[PDB]
Short mmCIF file of N, CA and C and ligand atoms in Angstrom, two decimals:
data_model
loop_
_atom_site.label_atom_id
_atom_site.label_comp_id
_atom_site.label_asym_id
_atom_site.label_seq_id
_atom_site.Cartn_x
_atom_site.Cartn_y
_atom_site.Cartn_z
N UNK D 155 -4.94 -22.97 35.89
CA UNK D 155 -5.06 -23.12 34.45
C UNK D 155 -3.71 -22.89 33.77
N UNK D 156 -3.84 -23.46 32.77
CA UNK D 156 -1.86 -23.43 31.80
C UNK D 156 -1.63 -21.53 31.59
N UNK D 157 -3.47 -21.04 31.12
CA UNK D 157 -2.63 -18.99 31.67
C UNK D 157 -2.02 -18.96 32.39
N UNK D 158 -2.17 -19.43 33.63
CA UNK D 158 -0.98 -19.30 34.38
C UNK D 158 0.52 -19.48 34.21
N UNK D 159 1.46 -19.40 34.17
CA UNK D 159 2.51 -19.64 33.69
C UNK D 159 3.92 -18.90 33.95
N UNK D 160 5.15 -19.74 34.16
CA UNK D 160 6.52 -18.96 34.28
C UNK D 160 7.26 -19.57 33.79
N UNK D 161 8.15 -19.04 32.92
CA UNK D 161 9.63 -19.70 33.04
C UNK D 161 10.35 -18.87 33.46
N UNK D 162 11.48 -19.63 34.23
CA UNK D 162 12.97 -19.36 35.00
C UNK D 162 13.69 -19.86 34.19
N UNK D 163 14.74 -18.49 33.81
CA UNK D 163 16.08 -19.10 32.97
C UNK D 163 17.33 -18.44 33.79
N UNK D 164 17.99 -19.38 34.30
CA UNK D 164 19.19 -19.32 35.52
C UNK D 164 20.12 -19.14 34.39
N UNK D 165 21.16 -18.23 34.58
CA UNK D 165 22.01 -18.24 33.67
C UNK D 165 23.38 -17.80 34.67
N UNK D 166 24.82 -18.31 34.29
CA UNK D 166 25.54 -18.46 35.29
C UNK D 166 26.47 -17.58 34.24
N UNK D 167 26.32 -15.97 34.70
CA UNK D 167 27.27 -15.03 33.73
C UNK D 167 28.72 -14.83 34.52
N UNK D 168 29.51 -15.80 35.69
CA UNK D 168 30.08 -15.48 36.32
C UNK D 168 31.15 -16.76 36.05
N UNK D 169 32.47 -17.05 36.77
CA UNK D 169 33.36 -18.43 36.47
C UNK D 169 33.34 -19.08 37.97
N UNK D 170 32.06 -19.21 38.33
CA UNK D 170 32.19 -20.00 39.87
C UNK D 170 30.90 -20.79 39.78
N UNK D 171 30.67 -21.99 39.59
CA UNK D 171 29.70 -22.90 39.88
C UNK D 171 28.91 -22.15 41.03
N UNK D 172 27.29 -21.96 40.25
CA UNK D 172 25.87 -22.01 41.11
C UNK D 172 25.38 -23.35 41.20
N UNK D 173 24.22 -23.55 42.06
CA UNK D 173 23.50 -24.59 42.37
C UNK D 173 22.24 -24.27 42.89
N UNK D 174 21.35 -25.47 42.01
CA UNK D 174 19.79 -25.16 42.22
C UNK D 174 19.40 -25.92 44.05
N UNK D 175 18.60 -25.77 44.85
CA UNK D 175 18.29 -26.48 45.59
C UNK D 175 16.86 -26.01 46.11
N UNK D 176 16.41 -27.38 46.62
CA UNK D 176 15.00 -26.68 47.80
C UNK D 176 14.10 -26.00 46.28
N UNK D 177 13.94 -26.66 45.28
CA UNK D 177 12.76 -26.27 44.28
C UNK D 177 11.49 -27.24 45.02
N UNK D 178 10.43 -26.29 44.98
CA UNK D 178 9.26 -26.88 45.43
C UNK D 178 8.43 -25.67 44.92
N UNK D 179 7.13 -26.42 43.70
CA UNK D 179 6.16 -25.95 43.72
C UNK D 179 4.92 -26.17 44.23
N UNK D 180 4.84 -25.17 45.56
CA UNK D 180 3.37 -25.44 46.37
C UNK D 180 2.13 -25.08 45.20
N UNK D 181 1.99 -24.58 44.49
CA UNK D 181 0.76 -24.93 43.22
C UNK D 181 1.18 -25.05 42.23
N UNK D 182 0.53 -25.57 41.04
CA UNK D 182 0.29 -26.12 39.87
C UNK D 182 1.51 -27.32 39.70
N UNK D 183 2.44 -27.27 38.71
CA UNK D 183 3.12 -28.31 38.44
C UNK D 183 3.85 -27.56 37.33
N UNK D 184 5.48 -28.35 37.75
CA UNK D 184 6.09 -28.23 36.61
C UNK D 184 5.91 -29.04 35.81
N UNK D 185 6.75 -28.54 34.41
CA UNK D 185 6.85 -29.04 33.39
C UNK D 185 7.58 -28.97 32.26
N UNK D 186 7.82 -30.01 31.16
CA UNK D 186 8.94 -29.40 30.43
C UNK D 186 8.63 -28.43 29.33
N UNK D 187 9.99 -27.93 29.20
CA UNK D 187 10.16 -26.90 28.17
C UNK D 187 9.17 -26.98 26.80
N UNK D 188 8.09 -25.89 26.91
CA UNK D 188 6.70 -25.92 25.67
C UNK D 188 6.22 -27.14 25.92
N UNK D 189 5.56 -27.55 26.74
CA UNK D 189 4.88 -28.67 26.82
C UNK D 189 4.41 -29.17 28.21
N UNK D 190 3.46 -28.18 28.56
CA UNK D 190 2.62 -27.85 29.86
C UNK D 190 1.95 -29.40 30.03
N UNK D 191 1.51 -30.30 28.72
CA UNK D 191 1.22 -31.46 29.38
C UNK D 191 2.09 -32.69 29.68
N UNK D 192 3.40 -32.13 29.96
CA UNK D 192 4.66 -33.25 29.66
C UNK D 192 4.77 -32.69 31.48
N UNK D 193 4.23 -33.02 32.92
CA UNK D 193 4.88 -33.06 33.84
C UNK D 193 6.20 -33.03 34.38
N UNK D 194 6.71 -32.58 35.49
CA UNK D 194 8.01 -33.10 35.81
C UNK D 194 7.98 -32.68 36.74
N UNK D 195 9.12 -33.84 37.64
CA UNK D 195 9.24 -33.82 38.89
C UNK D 195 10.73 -32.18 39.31
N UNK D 196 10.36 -32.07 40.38
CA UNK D 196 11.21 -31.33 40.42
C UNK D 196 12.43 -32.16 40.95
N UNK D 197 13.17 -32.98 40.70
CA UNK D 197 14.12 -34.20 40.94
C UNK D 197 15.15 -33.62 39.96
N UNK D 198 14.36 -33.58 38.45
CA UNK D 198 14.93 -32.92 37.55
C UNK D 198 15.95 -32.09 37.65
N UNK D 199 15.61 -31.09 38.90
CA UNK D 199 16.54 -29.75 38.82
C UNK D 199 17.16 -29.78 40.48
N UNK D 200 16.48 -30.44 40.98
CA UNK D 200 16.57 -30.44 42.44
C UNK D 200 18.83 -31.02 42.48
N UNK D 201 19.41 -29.96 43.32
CA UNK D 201 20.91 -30.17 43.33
C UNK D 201 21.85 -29.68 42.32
N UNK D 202 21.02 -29.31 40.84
CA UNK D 202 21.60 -29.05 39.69
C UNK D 202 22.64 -27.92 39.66
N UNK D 203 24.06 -28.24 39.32
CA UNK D 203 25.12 -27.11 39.36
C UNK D 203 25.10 -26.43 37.87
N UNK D 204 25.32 -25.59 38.15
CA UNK D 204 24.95 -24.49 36.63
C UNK D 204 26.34 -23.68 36.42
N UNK D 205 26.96 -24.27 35.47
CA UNK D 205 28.42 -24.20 35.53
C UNK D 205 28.49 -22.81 34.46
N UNK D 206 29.73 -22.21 34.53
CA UNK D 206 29.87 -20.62 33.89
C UNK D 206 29.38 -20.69 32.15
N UNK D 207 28.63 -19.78 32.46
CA UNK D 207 28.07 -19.53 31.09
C UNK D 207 27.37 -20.59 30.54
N UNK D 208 26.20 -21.55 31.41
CA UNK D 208 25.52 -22.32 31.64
C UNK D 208 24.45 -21.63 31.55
N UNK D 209 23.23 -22.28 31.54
CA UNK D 209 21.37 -22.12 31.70
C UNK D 209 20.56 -23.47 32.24
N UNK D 210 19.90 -23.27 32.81
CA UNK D 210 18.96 -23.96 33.40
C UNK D 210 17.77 -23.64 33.47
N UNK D 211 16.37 -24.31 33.24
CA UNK D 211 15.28 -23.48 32.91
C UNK D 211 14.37 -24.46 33.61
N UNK D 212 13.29 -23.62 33.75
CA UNK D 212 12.59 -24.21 34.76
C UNK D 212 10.90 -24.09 34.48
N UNK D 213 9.62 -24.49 33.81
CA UNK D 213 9.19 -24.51 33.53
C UNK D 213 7.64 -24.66 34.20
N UNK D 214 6.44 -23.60 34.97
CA UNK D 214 5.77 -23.83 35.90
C UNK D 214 4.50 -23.27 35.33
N UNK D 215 3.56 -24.15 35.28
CA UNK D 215 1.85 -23.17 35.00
C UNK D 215 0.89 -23.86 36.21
N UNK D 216 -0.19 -23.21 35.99
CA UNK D 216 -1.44 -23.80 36.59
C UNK D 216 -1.82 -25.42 36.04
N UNK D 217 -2.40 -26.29 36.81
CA UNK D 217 -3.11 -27.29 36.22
C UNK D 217 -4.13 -27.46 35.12
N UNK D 218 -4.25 -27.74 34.47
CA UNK D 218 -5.13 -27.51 33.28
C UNK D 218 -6.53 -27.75 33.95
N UNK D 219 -7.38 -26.56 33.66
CA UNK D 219 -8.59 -26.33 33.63
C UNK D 219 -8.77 -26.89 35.11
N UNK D 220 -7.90 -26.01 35.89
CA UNK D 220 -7.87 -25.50 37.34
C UNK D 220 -8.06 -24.13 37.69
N UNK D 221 -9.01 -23.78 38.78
CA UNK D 221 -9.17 -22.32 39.31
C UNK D 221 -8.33 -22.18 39.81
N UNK D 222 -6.88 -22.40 39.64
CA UNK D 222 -5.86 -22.23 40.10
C UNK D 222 -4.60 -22.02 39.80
N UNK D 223 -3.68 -21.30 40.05
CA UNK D 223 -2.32 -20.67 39.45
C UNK D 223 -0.98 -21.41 39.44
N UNK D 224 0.19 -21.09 39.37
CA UNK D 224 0.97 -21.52 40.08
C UNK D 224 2.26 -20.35 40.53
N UNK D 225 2.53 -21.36 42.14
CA UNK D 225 3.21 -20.82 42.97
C UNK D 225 4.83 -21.47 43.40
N UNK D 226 5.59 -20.88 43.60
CA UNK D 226 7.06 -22.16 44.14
C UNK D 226 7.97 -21.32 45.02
N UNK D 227 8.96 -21.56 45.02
CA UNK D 227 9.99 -21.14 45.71
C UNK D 227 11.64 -22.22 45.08
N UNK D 228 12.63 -21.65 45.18
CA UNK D 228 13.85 -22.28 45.07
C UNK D 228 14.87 -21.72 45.87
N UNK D 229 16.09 -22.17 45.80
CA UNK D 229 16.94 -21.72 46.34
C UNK D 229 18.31 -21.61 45.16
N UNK D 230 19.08 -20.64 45.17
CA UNK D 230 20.74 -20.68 44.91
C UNK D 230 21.32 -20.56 45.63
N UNK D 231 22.17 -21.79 45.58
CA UNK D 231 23.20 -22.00 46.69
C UNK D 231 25.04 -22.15 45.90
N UNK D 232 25.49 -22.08 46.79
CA UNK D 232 27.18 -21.89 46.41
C UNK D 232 28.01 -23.01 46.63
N UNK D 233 28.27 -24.04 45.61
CA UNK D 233 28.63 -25.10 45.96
C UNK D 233 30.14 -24.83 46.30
N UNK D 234 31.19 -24.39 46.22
CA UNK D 234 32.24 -23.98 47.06
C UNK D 234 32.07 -23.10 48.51
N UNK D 235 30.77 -22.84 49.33
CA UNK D 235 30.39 -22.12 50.33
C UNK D 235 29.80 -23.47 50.92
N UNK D 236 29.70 -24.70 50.87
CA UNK D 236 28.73 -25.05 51.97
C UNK D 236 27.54 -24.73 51.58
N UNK D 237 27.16 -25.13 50.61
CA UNK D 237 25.60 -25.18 49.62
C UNK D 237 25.15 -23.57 50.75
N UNK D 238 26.03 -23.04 51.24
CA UNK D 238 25.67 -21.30 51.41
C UNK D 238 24.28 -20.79 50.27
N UNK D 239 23.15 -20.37 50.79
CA UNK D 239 22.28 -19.57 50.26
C UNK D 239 22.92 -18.76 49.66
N UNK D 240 22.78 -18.15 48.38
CA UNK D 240 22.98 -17.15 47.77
C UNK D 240 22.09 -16.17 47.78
N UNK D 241 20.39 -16.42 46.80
CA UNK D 241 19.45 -15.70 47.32
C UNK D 241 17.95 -16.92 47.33
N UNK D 242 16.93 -16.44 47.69
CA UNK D 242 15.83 -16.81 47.45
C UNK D 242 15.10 -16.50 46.99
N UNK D 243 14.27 -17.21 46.36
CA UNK D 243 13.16 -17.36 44.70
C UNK D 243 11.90 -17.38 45.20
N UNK D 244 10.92 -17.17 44.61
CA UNK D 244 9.37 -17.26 45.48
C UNK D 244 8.76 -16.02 44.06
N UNK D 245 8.17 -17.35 43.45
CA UNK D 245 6.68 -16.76 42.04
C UNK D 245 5.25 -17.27 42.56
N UNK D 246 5.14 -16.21 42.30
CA UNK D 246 3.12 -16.99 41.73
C UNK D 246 3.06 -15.96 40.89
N UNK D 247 2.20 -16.70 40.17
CA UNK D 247 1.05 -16.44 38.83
C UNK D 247 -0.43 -16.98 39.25
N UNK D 248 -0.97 -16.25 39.84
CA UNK D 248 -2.04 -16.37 40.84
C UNK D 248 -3.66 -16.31 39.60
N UNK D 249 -4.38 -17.36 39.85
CA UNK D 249 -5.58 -17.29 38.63
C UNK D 249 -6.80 -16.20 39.53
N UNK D 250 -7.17 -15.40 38.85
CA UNK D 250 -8.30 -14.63 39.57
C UNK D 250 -7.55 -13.68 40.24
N UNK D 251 -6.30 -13.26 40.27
CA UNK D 251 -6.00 -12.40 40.67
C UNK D 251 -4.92 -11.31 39.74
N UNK D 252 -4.84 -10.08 39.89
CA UNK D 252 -4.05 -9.28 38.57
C UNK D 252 -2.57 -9.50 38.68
N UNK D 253 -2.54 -9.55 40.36
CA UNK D 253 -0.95 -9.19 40.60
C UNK D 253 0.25 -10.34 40.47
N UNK D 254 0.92 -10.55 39.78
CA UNK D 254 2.00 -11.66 39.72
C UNK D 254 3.05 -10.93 40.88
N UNK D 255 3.72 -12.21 41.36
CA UNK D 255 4.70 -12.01 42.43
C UNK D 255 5.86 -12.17 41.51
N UNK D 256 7.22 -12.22 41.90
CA UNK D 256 8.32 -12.58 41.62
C UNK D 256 9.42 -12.02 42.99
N UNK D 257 10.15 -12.47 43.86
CA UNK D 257 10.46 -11.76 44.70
C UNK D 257 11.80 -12.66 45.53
N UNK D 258 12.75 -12.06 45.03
CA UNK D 258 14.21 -12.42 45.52
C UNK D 258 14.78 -11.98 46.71
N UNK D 259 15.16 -12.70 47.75
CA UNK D 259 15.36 -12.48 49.10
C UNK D 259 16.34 -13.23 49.96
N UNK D 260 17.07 -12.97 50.75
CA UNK D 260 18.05 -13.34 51.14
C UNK D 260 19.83 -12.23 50.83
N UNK D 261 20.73 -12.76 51.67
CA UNK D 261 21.73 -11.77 51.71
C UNK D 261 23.15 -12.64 51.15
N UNK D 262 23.77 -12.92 50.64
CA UNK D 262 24.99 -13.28 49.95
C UNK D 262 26.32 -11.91 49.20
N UNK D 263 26.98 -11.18 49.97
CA UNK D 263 27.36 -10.43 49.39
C UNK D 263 28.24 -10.44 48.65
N UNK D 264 29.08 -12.29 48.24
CA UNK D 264 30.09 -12.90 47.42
C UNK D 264 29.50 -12.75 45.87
N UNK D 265 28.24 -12.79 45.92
CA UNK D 265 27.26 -13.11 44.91
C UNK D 265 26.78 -11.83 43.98
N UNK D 266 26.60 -11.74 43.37
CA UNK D 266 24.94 -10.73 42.41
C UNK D 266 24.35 -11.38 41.62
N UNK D 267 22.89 -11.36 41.90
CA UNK D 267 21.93 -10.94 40.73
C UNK D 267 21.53 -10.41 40.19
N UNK D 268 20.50 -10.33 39.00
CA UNK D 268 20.24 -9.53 38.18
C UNK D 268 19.45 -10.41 37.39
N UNK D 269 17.80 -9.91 37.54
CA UNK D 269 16.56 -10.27 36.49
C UNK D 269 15.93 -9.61 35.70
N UNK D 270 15.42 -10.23 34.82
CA UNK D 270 14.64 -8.99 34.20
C UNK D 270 13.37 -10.02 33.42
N UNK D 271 12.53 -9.68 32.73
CA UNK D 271 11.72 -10.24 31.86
C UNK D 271 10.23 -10.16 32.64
N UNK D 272 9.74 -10.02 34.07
CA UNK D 272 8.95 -10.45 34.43
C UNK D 272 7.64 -9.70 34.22
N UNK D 273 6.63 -10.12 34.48
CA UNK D 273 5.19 -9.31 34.33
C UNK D 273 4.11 -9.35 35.44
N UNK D 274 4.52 -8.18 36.24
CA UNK D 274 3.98 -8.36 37.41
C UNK D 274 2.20 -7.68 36.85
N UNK D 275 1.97 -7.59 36.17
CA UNK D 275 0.17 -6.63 36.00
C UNK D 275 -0.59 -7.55 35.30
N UNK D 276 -1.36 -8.71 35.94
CA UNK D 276 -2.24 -9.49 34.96
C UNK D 276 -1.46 -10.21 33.97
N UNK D 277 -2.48 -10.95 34.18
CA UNK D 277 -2.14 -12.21 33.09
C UNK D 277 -0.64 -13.28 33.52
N UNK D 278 0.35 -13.88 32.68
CA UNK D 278 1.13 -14.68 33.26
C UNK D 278 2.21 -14.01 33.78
N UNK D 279 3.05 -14.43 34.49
CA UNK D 279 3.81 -14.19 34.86
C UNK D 279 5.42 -13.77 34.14
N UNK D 280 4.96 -14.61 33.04
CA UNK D 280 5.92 -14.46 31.66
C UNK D 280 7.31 -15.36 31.82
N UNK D 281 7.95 -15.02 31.06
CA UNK D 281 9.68 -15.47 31.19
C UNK D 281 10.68 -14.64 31.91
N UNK D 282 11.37 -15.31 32.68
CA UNK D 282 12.19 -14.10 33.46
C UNK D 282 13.79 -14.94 33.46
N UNK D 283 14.83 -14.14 33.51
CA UNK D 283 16.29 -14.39 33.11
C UNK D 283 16.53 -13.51 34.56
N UNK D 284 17.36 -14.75 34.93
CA UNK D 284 18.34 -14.65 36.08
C UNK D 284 19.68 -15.05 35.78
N UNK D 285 20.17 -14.08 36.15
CA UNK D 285 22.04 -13.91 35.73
C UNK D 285 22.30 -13.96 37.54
N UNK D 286 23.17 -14.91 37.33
CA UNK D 286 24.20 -14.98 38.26
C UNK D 286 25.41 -15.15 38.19
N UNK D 287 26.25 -14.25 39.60
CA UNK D 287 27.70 -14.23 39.06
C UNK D 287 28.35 -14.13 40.67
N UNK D 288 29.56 -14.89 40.86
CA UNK D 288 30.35 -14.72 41.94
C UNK D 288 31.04 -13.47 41.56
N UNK D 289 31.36 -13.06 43.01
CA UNK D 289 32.36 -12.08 42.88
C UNK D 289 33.47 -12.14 43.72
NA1 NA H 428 -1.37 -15.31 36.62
#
């Protein structure tokens, strides 16, 4: 269902080109910015370099008037590394269930992140801001 819901806002607080890759949502569907019935492919973002002091946003709910949530995964990668992993992304906003995921993984020690916004206790998953920065 559209309760379900996340946005990702990639923000590049650093002077070294990030890059989106490997976006795939295994449930519900993206979509664009306020407008859960406007679809989109993830093509959209799929390769996208997010240049310093850049944003990129990413827009994911449940299917409308689905017993069902939504779930994805992405990747940041380092386009001066050999599309090098930076870290890994992995949400759900799960319907029928309290607990929202959000959960960043992987090792890059050129790199940091830093999120905040999310709502892991019931209900959506909310908006969450990801700062990234080379070091
Ligand atoms: Na949810």
């Amino acid at each position: 269902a559209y309760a379900q819901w996340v946005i990702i806002i990639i923000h590049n607080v650093g002077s070294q080109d990030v890059k989106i890759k490997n976006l795939k949502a295994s449930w519900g569907k993206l979509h664009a910015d306020g407008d859960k019935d406007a679809e989109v492919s993830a093509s959209n973002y799929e390769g996208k370099i997010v240049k310093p002091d850049e944003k990129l946003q990413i827009n994911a709910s449940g299917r409308s008037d689905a017993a069902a949530g939504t779930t994805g995964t992405f990747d940041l990668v380092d386009p001066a590394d050999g599309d090098k992993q930076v870290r890994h992304f992995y949400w759900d906003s799960p319907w029928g269930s309290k607990t929202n995921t959000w959960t960043v993984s992987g090792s890059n020690t050129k790199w940091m992140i830093e999120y905040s916004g999310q709502n892991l206790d019931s209900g959506a998953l909310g908006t969450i801001t990801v700062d990234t920065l080379k070091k």
